[PDB]
Write a protein that binds this DNA or RNA. Structure first.
Lengths: 98, 77, 95, 110, 84, 97, 87, 95, 110
DNA sequence: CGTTAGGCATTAAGCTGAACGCACAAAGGAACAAAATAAACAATACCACCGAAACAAAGAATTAGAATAGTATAACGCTAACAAACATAAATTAGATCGGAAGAGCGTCGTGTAGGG
DNA sequence: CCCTACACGACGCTCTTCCGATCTAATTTATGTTTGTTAGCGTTATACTATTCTAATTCTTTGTTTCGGTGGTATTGTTTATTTTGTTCCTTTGTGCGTTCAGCTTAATGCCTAACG
């Protein structure tokens, strides 16, 4: 029987590691595929540089980390630790979009 | 409180007596409406009818100046 | 002499009895509508300005403001706007 | 000398907005050096439709409350009830327009 | 170039969103967050990409470059750096 | 002998104030408060009546947006009243500080 | 006395029934007893940030008076634009 | 011929070895700093533009940009900025 | 003919920013018609101080992590750790800069 | 191939008479507001328990760097040409200044409603 | 089940305010150059995608396990509905001072030529 840590110490370790990190999280090729497959619905046959899709990756990263920090600030208010879809709906309601 | 009040103008000279008249003659009538009607009446009043109040106001202004010579007036909060 | 302070209020009245020949409007909503028109004009002209600055062109044309209302106006309002805008400049260029 | 008859560009477009006013307003508006001929035409068209549309829904709200004067309350319900243009006017609040009626569904009593 | 790209919405993976939340200071994840995160990301990228498409269609190009994405994020009040 | 259960007249107050549209603050306290605050920058700073009125209008619009936000926050929090935790939550998620 | 205690609560001139009115516009049912001073803190921060901008506007233009259109510019500074005064 | 794409990067390097004569900098942060300078210049010049438009003056002077940095820069940074700005134009006007 | 020695206005101010570049950049920048003489001087002064200050704290953060190359991570901690200028840069996010390290005080274990 | 020295249209910098804004006097109630009591109900302290999610090995597409073929496409340099800028009236028209009229506030009746035993 | 304190229509007074007509600076719009940006066409070089190779890597999958979510029961305390006094705040014209505005004169000033890193 291998030793398993209590749930949360591994979690807190990867919190400090990944918030300590600097590299991109979302894998580049599926991100590229999603950007192209949603870009083809306005004017088809569109090419991108490395620079445009890299800046798009950075924009998506910043928006998602702000959304999840605000969602965690929502979920701590309910005396809760996990996150729920109602937390994300509350976050996008207080932001002013939905 | 030490604050020196403004002299009554001609409207004030006429409005004081007429407001007292309206309260005595027509009670249980709200004061704001009475002031509105007094304003309307004064606007309807002929210029000739208003000479005693005008002169009275001027006399009060003279007495005020004689009684309160430092009134240049400087309002402060 | 005296400062003449202008608005669009007669044209507000004109488009009002254009669409609805029956109703009136207070002075409140007339000033609201005037601030409405000048704020939307400011935003549209500024967007067309920065679009002309990016594309290295020293002018503003119908294409630039068409891109600007494509940018600002969200959804079906933009499509309605570009359709009637092309209608309006075909009217203007026909004469 | 004798010029021709003064036809305005608003008459040249079936238009109710002053073309020369917005032409000089772009010209002194310091947005670019030259200005295209049909760009104030396009501008006046989209502004006429924007307010024309605002008027159409505002008057329907005002007649809907059985009054023939346009009230900024009617303006508030027109720009907050319809969601198509509310996204343009999210950060803009009407003076003397109030808040559109809205009650929480849980705060009804049992 | 002989393909129409479809069904890549789940191209982003569940542990990648988990790693995203690990950057976001979030501790525990329910099993419903992933679809909602995909929807939120899809509509956000839809908005910025539509802005970049009409940008490129104005300037008579056939490709999309980085500075137009910078202008889209500048117009949406989400201005980024490091790209001119 | 006609004491109401608390909340029915609260619903009636909701309906009368959301139906109404006039100013909600007496003008003289806001005037004296603005006169107090603006003197901290410079002296002899008078105002037009439209200026102060506009300031009261903008303040009231900001407050009613804020309180709608905090009430939605409170009802996500499974409670039917507002608390200052909801106030700082809405001041966080909207991004003011 | 005319004024209770030591007074000097100009911001407390925005009294608890008035904040109750502003809250009942906002769609709330019950109000805790610890809302008012925090709402007053919102009043402080908002009026400081707008009045600083407006006094900057009128102090550049060599005028001792604060115009309502300068207030509309100061609210256009923060995405907080209102209508009905010109623009 | 070829498009010449300029930046402020040599001045970034110069102020870098002004304040810190020891450290280097990647190409990443150089482009970051370039976007930093042009974004702050854009915001400041646009604010000075609308201030000149409100006060009915057709120019931009040192007073206008002084009001602009008083407006945008929050706090002690604005005070530091106006002090050194007056220092800089006294240096410029002394010669 | 023979002109005098070309003294730049950056040398006339003890300045490290190009005065003529921002002078024409305001001139073609389409903000007003005429431009004052000391206004690019003021502009170059405040931009030099803004970035000079950014550099001072960025290099202290970079030496604080014992590296002599400036990293956008150091830029992120410099603009997010100090609150004096964070209010200017609330809506602006650094590419490849990450998030400043933080943790909720309740999520420490008992 | 970029930056700096001279010469005048044109624009603010003072400067004084004159129009405009705003505070503030009396008089009153009256809408408003501060305080005090049941009460009740809603926030809260805490327990069961459960199933929904952390930990972790075992494989499984899959990105990850590198050439490279080619290839549509930014990104040039001259034009020219069409469109705007700069004078020049005129004429519409937008706006200022007086008049009436009807549209909505005040209220008041009775009606319907929907909440405490 | 019970009755009964607060929101709405009909109508009349009421006042006010906004629609109609009229005069007049001004600015909008036909002519007619100059001039000067930009479609358009040839060119080119260039950077981007398709393809294919190791490789490494990280996603899924199938479990254990454990602990936060949720429902439930006291509990208590804290806000409300309501009365009972304080209390401040509405309206009007004329008077006085402070400020801003606009015409006016005049001094700075930067649009437009010609030469050094």
């Amino acid at each position: 029987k291998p030793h398993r840590y209590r749930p949360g110490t591994v979690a807190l370790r990867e919190i400090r590691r990944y918030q300590k990190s600097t590299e991109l999280l979302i894998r580049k090729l599926p991100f590229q595929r999603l950007v192209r497959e949603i870009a083809q619905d306005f004017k088809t046959d569109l090419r991108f540089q490395s620079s445009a899709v890299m800046a798009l990756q950075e924009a998506s990263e910043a928006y998602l980390v702000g959304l999840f920090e605000d969602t965690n600030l929502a979920a701590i208010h309910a005396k809760r630790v996990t996150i729920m879809p109602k937390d994300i709906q509350l976050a996008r309601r207080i932001r002013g979009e939905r | 409180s030490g604050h020196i009040k403004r002299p009554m103008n001609a409207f004030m000279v006429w409005s004081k007596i007429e407001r007292r008249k309206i309260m005595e003659q027509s009670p249980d009538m709200h004061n704001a409406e009475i002031s509105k009607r007094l304003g309307k009446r004064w606007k309807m009043l002929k210029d000739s009818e208003k000479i005693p109040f005008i002169r009275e106001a001027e006399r009060l202004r003279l007495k005020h100046m004689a009684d309160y010579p430092d009134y240049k007036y400087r309002p402060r909060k | 002499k005296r400062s003449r302070k202008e608005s669009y209020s007669v044209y507000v009245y004109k488009v009002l009895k254009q669409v609805h020949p029956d109703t009136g409007i207070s002075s409140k909503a007339m000033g609201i509508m005037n601030s409405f028109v000048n704020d939307i004009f400011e935003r549209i002209a500024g967007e067309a300005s920065r679009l002309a600055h990016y594309n290295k062109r020293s002018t503003i044309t119908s294409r630039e403001i068409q891109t600007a209302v494509r940018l600002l106006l969200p959804g079906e309002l933009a499509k309605h706007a570009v359709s009637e805008g092309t209608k309006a400049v075909t009217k203007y260029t026909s004469a | 000398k004798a010029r021709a008859k003064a036809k305005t560009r608003s008459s040249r477009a079936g238009l109710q907005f002053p073309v020369g006013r917005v032409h000089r307003l772009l010209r002194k508006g310091n947005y670019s050096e030259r200005v295209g001929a049909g760009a104030p035409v396009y501008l006046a068209a989209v502004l006429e439709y924007l307010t024309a549309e605002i008027l159409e829904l505002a008057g329907n709200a005002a007649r809907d409350n059985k009054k023939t004067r346009i009230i900024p309350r009617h303006l508030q319900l027109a720009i907050r009830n319809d969601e198509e243009l509310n996204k343009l006017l999210g950060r803009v609040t009407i003076a003397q327009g109030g808040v559109l009626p809205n009650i929480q569904a849980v705060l009804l009593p049992k | 170039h002989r393909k129409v790209l479809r069904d890549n919405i789940q191209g982003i993976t569940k542990p990648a969103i988990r790693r995203l939340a690990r950057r976001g200071g979030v501790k525990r994840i329910s099993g419903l967050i992933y679809e909602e995160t995909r929807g939120v990301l899809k509509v956000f990228l839809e908005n910025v990409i539509r802005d970049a498409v009409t940008y490129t269609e104005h300037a008579k190009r056939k490709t999309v470059t980085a500075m137009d994405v910078v202008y889209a994020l500048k117009r949406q009040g989400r201005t980024l750096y490091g790209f001119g």
